[PDB]
Amino acid sequence: SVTGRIVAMASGAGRPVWGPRDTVSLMRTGFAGNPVGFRSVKLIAEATAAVPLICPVLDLLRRPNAGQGRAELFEALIGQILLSGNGYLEAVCPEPGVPRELHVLRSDRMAVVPGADGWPVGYDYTVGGRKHRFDMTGHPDPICHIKSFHPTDDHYGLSPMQAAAVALDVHNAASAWSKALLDNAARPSGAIIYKGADGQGVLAPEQYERLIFEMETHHQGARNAGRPMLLEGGLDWKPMGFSPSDMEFHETKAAAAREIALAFGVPPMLIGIPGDATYANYAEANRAFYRLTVLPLLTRVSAALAWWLSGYLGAQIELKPDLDQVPALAVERDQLWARIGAAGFLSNSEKRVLLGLPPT
């Protein structure tokens, strides 16, 4: 905070700081463009919305606004964090405490203002040429700004799609390689070469319609596969091939489809990409998914809702994921109940306090 004043002047106080320009184009080319970048965010954002929470405040979260439910809110919230590294939540307060409206402001059209002491004073929702200038020079601070970790930038997040932005363009263009190869390719199944007495000679349109009708009827198609095809003088049939037949950038697409899944943190088994068996039997890969890239993400966002929404209340509230009755963690729950349940030496109430039960 003491050094906060020094970085603020360099950027320029009172003026909007934009950060990354090409953020909106990674969405259309990397999330609406390829299925791997599409499925990876949809797999996470529909997983963090499904996790229950532990606190009143959750009555706001259950019904944030019209037409945007509890689970639909976090899909919009985490879906901006995975896409552009930043999450925004406007609170509309007709009432003084616990404001009854939440709105995920998209992070394409939002810009920060550094202000005096380096910590932000303005946020600017910029649609068309129109700005809004939300104000942070107050106590309730009407927008929570959830940052992904960015080491070099002081105001935004890193957005894992930016780290995979080369592997998206490999997977977008290798998939479009095979598309435009199926659309721009002339393979013939042969060529009836007609030289003539000279090195060059055309055949007359009388002879040419004769050549079609014996080729149309008697030689093409499945039903004429293999006629013995008499070739008189001058004529010759050179059959062409198609030498790379399968596998046009097949492994570099399948390797880039795994590096996209690597950056968002989904395992290759969940998304459905082919590859070597790393995880075994989905009791691991679903448990690894909710432990390395979902529950760390959800306990970081819920820790920002636990502090931003407590600024509207008087008492501070904690708000964490449940990490109980989330059915992907049952292999960590069998393993912990059967450990203490088999420990017969310590008594009955001495293990209800370990497994989390109210003792009797």
């Binding site: 934009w18 320009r21 910029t126 649609v127 068309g128 040429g129 129109r130």
Partner: protein, 271 residues
């Protein structure tokens, strides 16, 4: 981050009456004259004293358009959107002050000015300074103070000066017979921003001091000048017409002239 030249931002938008309008035009309705009631006689007919003839002034609500062609270090979509909003904030400022009738808002300077004391409704009133080149040589600032006190006490509750930078320069260049700077006395003061108890708006589209130019205005522009507009800004992110250049289309529509001819008074630098 790509830089640009920093232009003037003060635009007469924050002191004039900004009205959100949705139709093609905005019609303000001002009566031109008084009731004309007289003290009645005890034995007289006493009928039809008078009636204020009303007048509709039409804000045409013109449109403003700028069409640049776009032709990963800095991102054009945000930067060009932050430049064209500045140009639409600055190009309407010239129309609000010295715009003419054709396709653009007519500014308050282009309204057939008549010398004050012979003031009628259809015009704006001015006060003369003296010699034609500049302020008067014998007593400077007498033109400024009688410009203030030749307006009307009801509009001077919230009125402001409108100048450009190098007319406020020539105002701060005024000095007494010892040379002690009548406005902001020391060389350590700065812009005092409260000329004659009233705010100053440095609007660069005002003319400078010339032979007959009206370089200083003063008024309650909340009653005087009505800016009728639509708040949005059109954003056609065009992916057609030219593959080479995006050629974004951005337009804001805006209109305005004077609603009240009594609010604004001008300073003519002549005799």
């Amino acid at each position: 981050t790509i830089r640009g030249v920093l232009r003037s931002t003060a635009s007469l938008r924050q002191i004039a009456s900004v009205v959100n309008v949705e139709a093609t035009s905005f019609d303000v309705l001002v009566d031109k004259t008084d009731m004309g009631s007289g003290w009645a006689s005890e034995t007289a007919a006493l009928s039809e004293t008078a009636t204020p003839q009303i007048d509709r002034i039409t804000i045409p609500l013109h449109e403003l358009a700028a069409m640049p062609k776009a032709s990963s270090a800095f991102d054009i979509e945000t930067w060009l959107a932050n430049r064209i909003a500045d140009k639409f904030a600055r190009a309407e400022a010239a129309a609000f002050i010295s715009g003419d009738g054709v396709d653009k808002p007519t500014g308050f300077l282009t309204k057939t000015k008549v010398a004050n004391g012979a003031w009628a409704w259809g015009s704006l009133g001015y006060v003369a300074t003296g010699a034609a080149g500049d302020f008067a040589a014998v007593n400077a600032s007498d033109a400024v103070v009688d410009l203030v006190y030749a307006l009307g006490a009801e509009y001077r509750a919230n009125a402001s000066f409108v100048m450009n930078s190098k007319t406020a320069g020539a105002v701060r260049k005024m000095k007494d017979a010892d040379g002690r700077f009548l406005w902001a006395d020391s060389l350590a003061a700065g812009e005092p921003a409260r000329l004659m108890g009233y705010p100053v708006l440095i609007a660069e589209d005002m003319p400078d001091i010339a032979a007959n130019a009206y370089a200083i205005a003063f008024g309650d522009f909340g009653n005087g000048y009505t800016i009728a507009e639509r708040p949005d800004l059109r954003v056609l992110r065009d992916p057609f017409s030219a593959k080479p250049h995006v050629l974004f289309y951005a337009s804001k529509r805006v209109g305005g002239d004077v609603s009240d001819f009594a609010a604004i008074k001008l300073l003519k630098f002549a005799a």
